[PDB]
Write a protein that binds this ligand. Structure first.
Ligand SMILES: *SC(Nc1cc(C(F)(F)F)cc(C(F)(F)F)c1)C(C#N)C(N)=O
Length: 559
């Protein structure tokens, strides 16, 4: 029942890997303590292998089965459609890993006969063969972090031709089933603002609110074959075309449940018997399984009025308190149940009586004030990682611009407005690349976005209040100021100064650029403006933006 088995072959890199923070003429204006920022590489793959490799034991009781039965009952009301090859192709990221059969993502998006013909041959094989393990590539991801150094995370994915097939059979499923099964408990249906709203209202729904976050130790590795088959049983409850049922069964048996691992050099590194992190069902599967175990655990632990918020492996639970004494006890029972379900906690869960102190999805609720002086709740986070990555993308061009995603997701925060917005717009101006579309990710899905559209985008997602929030909490302000000292980032007072210049520079550009300067930096000037709704805002088609999670799902949503 081990999560993995290795042969001894090393996880090899597919190209050159950089560990040290690249430095250019712009780096110092943002961050000075360069030694604190690094990128993980395959050099540490071995350390990760040991952490994610362990035996899984599972004891399923009646609470587990009762929840699953309820989940299946809801899933039976879902009707999902098969995606055509062309539709699946359009969902493929322009720069997705190329196939090992003579074609790349570019060929897929263009519907080249070579790509389409191979995809049809892969689809045909899936329908006729439901036993042969599908090959997968295992790689060490290159992610940037701030020291205090974690080993590189592993990524496992099937060939491009197979990924297109997953879309055809399961895209509609993983996109609509979760919300139906988990209702308001499914986190990916909320934008940052709706997320905070659901958290605050739930916290109020309890006479004596009590909540906590639950972090499973290497969730992917705790996912057993049973969990993956139970996930397929849930998918099968949907009203599907017989052809989709066969493909889903085949993908489950041949890919999701497990398979051989091949490094970039073509060598067999071993075998996987747990969750593959690079498949379309990774997000949906983790979410369903976490919600299943956690819901069953809540009953086993005897938690009153348990409301949950689940995002993949990230779990948040809010319920009626029963005294710090009983609360601590119930939590331990919960943890015990989760452990029995094969989902032990990396870090022991602690009860919280302060909403703002609960951290979920690396975020926490906080409060600020609008133009009216009204207390307003918003979503924020520790800016350490966002700033380290911003530093990296400052001197290195990356496939995914985290700074852009962070601005969109945390536009209302103190750090994103004063630092991220100021710094990157300053750069875009100097290079005259304000209207150049950039790729970023939101809930795992890849989006192509032009910086000049940030004003309209933010207005639609967060409202006009985002452009005028003030008087942040002492806790939030202090966490930011501390993070800057740690990384050697100039104080906020410096950023305010720079923003005045960036703002005036944008206003001078006029048009699109003027709108940015006016709305994005209205906080920099002493005498703020009026800031009225933006006409183009509505024209924006931000539908599939916050519907579901697609982490590792190789999904692209052309904007
Ligand atoms: S927990 C989670 N998704 C998620 C990540 C982040 C951040 F800050 F880490 F980038 C912020 C949010 C938000 F804004 F609160 F909704 C959500 C995932 C998992 N597991 C995931 N796969 O996206």
């Amino acid at each position: 029942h081990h999560s993995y088995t290795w042969t001894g072959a090393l996880i090899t890199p597919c190209a050159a890997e950089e560990s040290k923070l690249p430095i250019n003429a712009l780096s110092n204006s943002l961050l000075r303590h360069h030694n604190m920022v690094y990128a993980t590489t395959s050099r540490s793959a071995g350390l990760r292998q040991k952490k994610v490799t362990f035996d899984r034991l599972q004891v399923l009781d009646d609470h587990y089965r009762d929840v699953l039965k309820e989940m299946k009952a809801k899933a039976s009301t879902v009707k999902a459609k098969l995606l055509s090859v062309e539709e699946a192709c359009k969902l493929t990221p322009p720069h997705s890993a190329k196939s090992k059969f003579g074609y790349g993502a570019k060929d897929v998006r263009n519907l080249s006969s070579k790509a389409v013909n191979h995809i049809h041959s892969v689809w045909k094989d899936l329908l006729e063969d439901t036993v042969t393990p599908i090959d997968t590539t295992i790689m060490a991801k290159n992610e940037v972090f701030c020291v205090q150094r974690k080993p590189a995370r592993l990524i496992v994915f099937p060939d491009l031709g197979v990924r297109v097939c997953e879309k055809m059979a399961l895209y509609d499923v993983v996109s609509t089933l979760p919300q139906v099964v988990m209702g308001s408990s499914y986190g990916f249906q909320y934008s940052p603002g709706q997320r905070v709203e659901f958290l605050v209202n739930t916290w109020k729904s309890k006479k004596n609110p009590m909540g906590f976050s639950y972090d499973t130790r290497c969730f992917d590795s705790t996912v057993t074959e049973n969990d993956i088959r139970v996930e397929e049983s849930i998918y099968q409850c949907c009203d599907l075309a017989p052809e989709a049922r066969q493909a889903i069964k085949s993908l489950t048996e041949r890919l999701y449940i497990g398979g051989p691992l091949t490094n970039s050099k073509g060598q067999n590194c071993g075998y996987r018997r747990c969750r593959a992190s690079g498949v379309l069902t990774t997000s949906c599967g983790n979410t369903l399984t976490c919600y299943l175990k956690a819901s069953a655990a809540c009953r086993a632990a005897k938690l009153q009025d348990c409301t949950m918020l689940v995002n993949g492996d990230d779990l948040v639970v809010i319920c009626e308190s029963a005294g710090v004494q009983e609360d601590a006890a119930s939590l331990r029972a919960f943890t015990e149940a989760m452990t029995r379900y094969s989902a032990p906690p990396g870090d022991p869960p602690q009860p919280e009586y302060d909403l703002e102190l609960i951290t979920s999805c690396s975020s926490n609720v906080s409060v600020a004030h609008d133009a009216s002086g009204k207390r307003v709740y918003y979503l924020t986070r520790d800016p350490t990682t966002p700033l380290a990555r911003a530093a990296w993308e400052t001197a290195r061009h990356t496939p995914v611009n985290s700074w852009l995603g962070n601005i969109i997701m945390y536009a209302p925060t103190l750090w994103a407005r004063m630092i991220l917005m100021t710094h990157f717009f300053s750069i875009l101006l100097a290079q005259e690349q304000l209207e150049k579309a950039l790729d970023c990710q939101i809930y795992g899905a890849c989006y192509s976005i032009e910086p000049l559209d940030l004003p309209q985008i933010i207005e639609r997602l967060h409202g006009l209040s985002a452009f005028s929030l003030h008087s942040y909490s002492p806790g939030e302000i202090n966490r930011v100021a501390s993070c800057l000292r740690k990384l050697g980032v100039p104080p906020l007072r410096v950023w305010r100064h720079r923003a005045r210049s960036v703002r005036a520079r944008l206003l001078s550009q006029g048009g699109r650029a003027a709108t940015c300067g006016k709305y994005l930096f209205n906080w920099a000037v002493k005498t703020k403006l009026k800031l009225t709704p933006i006409p183009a805002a509505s024209q924006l088609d931000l539908s599939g933006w916050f519907v579901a999670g697609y982490s590792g799902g190789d999904i692209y949503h052309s904007l």
